[PDB]
Enzyme design. Structure first.
Site, PDB file in Angstrom:
ATOM      1  N   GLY A  74       1.892 -10.227   6.331  1.00  0.00           N
ATOM      2  CA  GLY A  74       2.570  -8.862   6.759  1.00  0.00           C
ATOM      3  C   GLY A  74       3.129  -7.980   5.688  1.00  0.00           C
ATOM      4  O   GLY A  74       3.520  -8.460   4.636  1.00  0.00           O
ATOM      5  N   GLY A  93       9.014  -3.865   2.055  1.00  0.00           N
ATOM      6  CA  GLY A  93       8.939  -5.354   1.774  1.00  0.00           C
ATOM      7  C   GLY A  93       7.753  -5.918   2.227  1.00  0.00           C
ATOM      8  O   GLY A  93       6.823  -5.309   2.610  1.00  0.00           O
ATOM      9  N   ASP A 113      13.876  -4.726  18.881  1.00  0.00           N
ATOM     10  CA  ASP A 113      12.537  -4.035  18.463  1.00  0.00           C
ATOM     11  C   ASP A 113      11.611  -5.224  19.098  1.00  0.00           C
ATOM     12  O   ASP A 113      10.617  -5.704  18.522  1.00  0.00           O
ATOM     13  CB  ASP A 113      12.401  -4.230  17.019  1.00  0.00           C
ATOM     14  CG  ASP A 113      11.326  -3.306  16.777  1.00  0.00           C
ATOM     15  OD1 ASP A 113      10.997  -2.359  17.631  1.00  0.00           O
ATOM     16  OD2 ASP A 113      10.948  -3.303  15.621  1.00  0.00           O
TER      17      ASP A 113
END
Ligand code: H6K
EC number: 2.7.11.1
Length: 267
Positions: free
Chosen positions: A15, A16, A117
């Site tokens: 998936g 910085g 989140d």
């Protein structure tokens, strides 16, 4: 003790940046989060964590201005990729993922941590499809020395954020995570997000408050999980259902899902 046991090969981008790392000796697979200098708080919060539905933290290494975070590799990928657009997933699979999400959230709130989140991109699956809460980059401590501190910072992802974050200066942390869990449940059962954001200006949000459940995404959801969503997606966070009451909900306790099929023979 054993030579080369500390050597890891970075084999692919997950998936910085997050890279899949494989041990040179043991072939153990871990996820390495590389942060080119939020992160000091992320490591500190990750050091407190130990639960079967929370991404494991193995440790961290600093090489100059770069931080390396050694985290659990989850071969099942993101919950996001199990949601079929405009369809969702079978109700028994969503119930099982929702049970595991509640176990993870109960654990975090119990140690005074709010994730802030929660969304399907941050919910990872292991080889046995066990859900793991990931990325504590926006997480914070809301209870310390048994004293609750009210939050005021704008954090999260708009389609998953609770309406009090947009309307009030201060708010309790726990109802915010409960709300985002309800949006995740909606996404799993309908394959769509109900609104861009929970504000009066959003027509979809107004329709929900006026109980227009004959519209999408609500029309695609069975009355039992929809009754649970009516208790979670409540605008007033003080009236919103708490996790102890979610665990008492009728759909939450409805038998739907068979165990993993286990090898069997006849005669
Ligand atoms: N922050 C953070 C974070 C991000 N990822 C972590 N672990 C992990 O295994 N991530 C992952 C794994 C996959 C993936 C993608 C496709 C197929 C299989 C796995 N995507 N992302 C652990 N912590």
């Amino acid at each position: 003790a054993v030579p080369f046991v500390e050597d890891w090969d970075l084999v692919q981008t997950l998936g910085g940046e997050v890279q899949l790392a494989v041990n040179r000796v043991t072939e153990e697979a871990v996820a390495v989060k590389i942060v080119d200098m939020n992160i000091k708080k992320e490591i500190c919060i990750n050091k407190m964590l130990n639960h079967e539905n929370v991404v494991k933290f193995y440790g961290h290494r600093r090489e100059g201005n770069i931080q390396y975070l050694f985290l659990e590799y989850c071969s099942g990928g993101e919950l996001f990729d199990r949601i079929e657009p405009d369809i969702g997933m079978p109700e028994p699979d969503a119930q099982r993922f929702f049970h595991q999400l509640m176990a993870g959230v109960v654990y975090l709130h119990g140690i005074g941590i709010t994730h802030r989140d929660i969304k399907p991109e941050n919910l990872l699956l292991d080889e046995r499809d066990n859900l793991k809460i990931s990325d504590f980059g926006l997480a914070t401590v809301f209870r310390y020395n048994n004293r609750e501190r009210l939050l005021n910072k704008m954090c999260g992802t708009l389609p998953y954020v609770a309406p009090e974050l947009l309307k009030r200066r201060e708010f309790h942390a726990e109802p915010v995570d409960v709300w985002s869990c309800g949006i995740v449940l909606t996404a799993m059962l309908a394959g769509e997000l109900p609104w861009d954001q929970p504000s009066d200006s959003c027509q979809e949000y107004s329709d929900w408050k006026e109980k227009k459940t004959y519209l999408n995404p609500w029309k695609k959801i069975d009355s039992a999980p929809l009754a649970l969503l009516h208790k979670i997606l409540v605008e007033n966070p003080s009236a919103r259902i708490t996790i102890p009451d979610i665990k008492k909900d009728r759909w939450y306790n409805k038998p739907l899902k068979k165990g993993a099929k286990r090898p069997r023979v006849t005669s």
